[PDB]
C-alpha cells in the first residue's frame, strides 16, 4: 500500500503515468489514514496537484472537457484529503491552497465539467469548515469566500447551493463569523438579501435540504441583536406561512428551527 503510494507519487512526474497515478492515489484516500502526510511531505507532490489545477485555468471561454475535469477532481479530492487531516490542515491553510480553488467557485459556466469541478471544490472548502476550527473560519473570513458562496447560493445547481449554504452556515455559526457578518450593515444585508432570494426560488423549486440549511442561517443570524432587528422587518413571508407546508411535512427539525426563529424575533 505504502509501496504502491510511493510508486504512484513518482509516476505523477511522467505524463504517460500521471493520470493513472492520480486516480490510484485518490482511490487510497478511503483506506490509507496516513495518505495526507505522505502526500504533503513527499517532495513535489502538492505542487503536482496544484499544477493539475493551474493547468486548466486557461480552460475557464469554457473549454474544459469531462476528461480534464475528472482528472482535476481527483487532484482536488487528494487536496481535500490533505485539508481533512489534522497533521496537514494548518500547513494547507498557511500555503493558501484554498485560493487555488476559488476560480472554480467563481466561474458562472453552466457546463457539466465545471459543475463537477465546482462541487468538488466546494467539497474541499466544506471539508475545512466541517472541522469548525477557528483557524479555518478566520482564514476563510480574510480570503472572502463569502461572496463566492453567495453567488453560488443564488445561481448554482440545487446541490451547489446546498454546499455553499452549508459553508456560509458554518461561518455564521461561529461567533467570529457571525460578528464579522453583522459588523457592517452591508455585509449583513448582502447575506440576508441572498437568503431572501433563495427563499423565493425555493417556493418555486422546493428542496428540503437546501431550505433546512437556509433556515439554519436565518436562525443563527437572529442571535445577533442588529440582525434580529432587521429580520424583524425583512424576514420573508414564506418562512411564516404555508409556502413550505408540504416540504416541511416530515422535517421536525426545520419546523422547530423556524418556530425558534420567529420567537427570537420578538
Amino acid at each position: 500500500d505504502r509501496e504502491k503510494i510511493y510508486q504512484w507519487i513518482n509516476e505523477l512526474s511522467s505524463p504517460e503515468t500521471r493520470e493513472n497515478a492520480l486516480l490510484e492515489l485518490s482511490k487510497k484516500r478511503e483506506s490509507v489514514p496516513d495518505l495526507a502526510p505522505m502526500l504533503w511531505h513527499s517532495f513535489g507532490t502538492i505542487a503536482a496537484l496544484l499544477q493539475e489545477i493551474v493547468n486548466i485555468y486557461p480552460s475557464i471561454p469554457p473549454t474544459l472537457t469531462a476528461h480534464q475535469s475528472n482528472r482535476v477532481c481527483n487532484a482536488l479530492a487528494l487536496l481535500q484529503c490533505v485539508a481533512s487531516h489534522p497533521e496537514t490542515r494548518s500547513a494547507f491553510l498557511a500555503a493558501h491552497i484554498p485560493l487555488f480553488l476559488y476560480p472554480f467557485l467563481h466561474t458562472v459556466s453552466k457546463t457539466r465539467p465545471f459543475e463537477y469541478l465546482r462541487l468538488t471544490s466546494l467539497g474541499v472548502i466544506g471539508a475545512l469548515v466541517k472541522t469548525d476550527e477557528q483557524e479555518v473560519i478566520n482564514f476563510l473570513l480574510t480570503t472572502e469566500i463569502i461572496p463566492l458562496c453567495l453567488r453560488i447560493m443564488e445561481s448554482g445547481s440545487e446541490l451547489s447551493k446546498t454546499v455553499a449554504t452549508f459553508i456560509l452556515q458554518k461561518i455564521l455559526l461561529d461567533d467570529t463569523g457571525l460578528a464579522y457578518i453583522c459588523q457592517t450593515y452591508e455585509r449583513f444585508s448582502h447575506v440576508a438579501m441572498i437568503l431572501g432570494k433563495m427563499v423565493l426560488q425555493l417556493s418555486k423549486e422546493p428542496s428540503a435540504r437546501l431550505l433546512k440549511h437556509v433556515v439554519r442561517c436565518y436562525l443563527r443570524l437572529s442571535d445577533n441583536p442588529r440582525a434580529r432587528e432587521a429580520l424583524r422587518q425583512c424576514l420573508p413571508d414564506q418562512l411564516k406561512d404555508t409556502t413550505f407546508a408540504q416540504v416541511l411535512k416530515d422535517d421536525t427539525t426545520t419546523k422547530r428551527w423556524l418556530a425558534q426563529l420567529v420567537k427570537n424575533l420578538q
Binding site: 475535469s69 475528472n70 477532481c73 479530492a77 481535500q80 463537477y116 468538488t120 467539497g123 446541490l159 452549508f166
Partner: peptide, 24 residues
C-alpha cells in the same frame, strides 16, 4: 447538454462521494 461519457460518470460520482462526507 445531457451527454455523459465515462469521465462524466466518474467525475459526478467522485463529486457526490466528496460531498457525502459532509452530511448535508
Amino acid at each position: 447538454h445531457m451527454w455523459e461519457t465515462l469521465d462524466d460518470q466518474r467525475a459526478l460520482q467522485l463529486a457526490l462521494d466528496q460531498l457525502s462526507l459532509l452530511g448535508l
